[PDB]
Amino acid sequence: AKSAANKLDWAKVISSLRITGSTATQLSSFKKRNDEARRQLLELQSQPTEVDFSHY
């Protein structure tokens, strides 16, 4: 699932907690989470390509 990717991500953010000199690796990961969450809402926002021509 998407949850596998995200679980490994947030676990790794908290692993990245346990390592220093990697203070912006997690910020890149956060961005990856953001856009991942963006594409699902992009997809949910969708207007189906076809025009309505049955009713409309």
């Binding site: 390592i19 220093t20 000199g21 990697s22």
Partner: protein, 62 residues
């Protein structure tokens, strides 16, 4: 009686009032196409970035 008179008069002497499809076009938003199919730019293409990154952050994990 009067019903018949009106019915007849009304129907006969003008059924529909004039209308023109061409005039309608001005008053409605016209279809216009999306511009560009678009292709995403090749993000971080090649090891130019990698060689840079390995050097840039040779930062260890403490």
């Amino acid at each position: 009686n009067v019903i018949q008179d009106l019915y007849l008069r009304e129907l006969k002497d003008t059924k529909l009032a004039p209308s023109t499809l061409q005039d309608a076009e001005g008053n409605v938003k016209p279809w216009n196409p999306p511009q560009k199919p678009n292709l995403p730019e090749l993000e971080l293409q090649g090891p130019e970035a990698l060689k840079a990154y390995t050097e840039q952050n040779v930062e260890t994990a403490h």
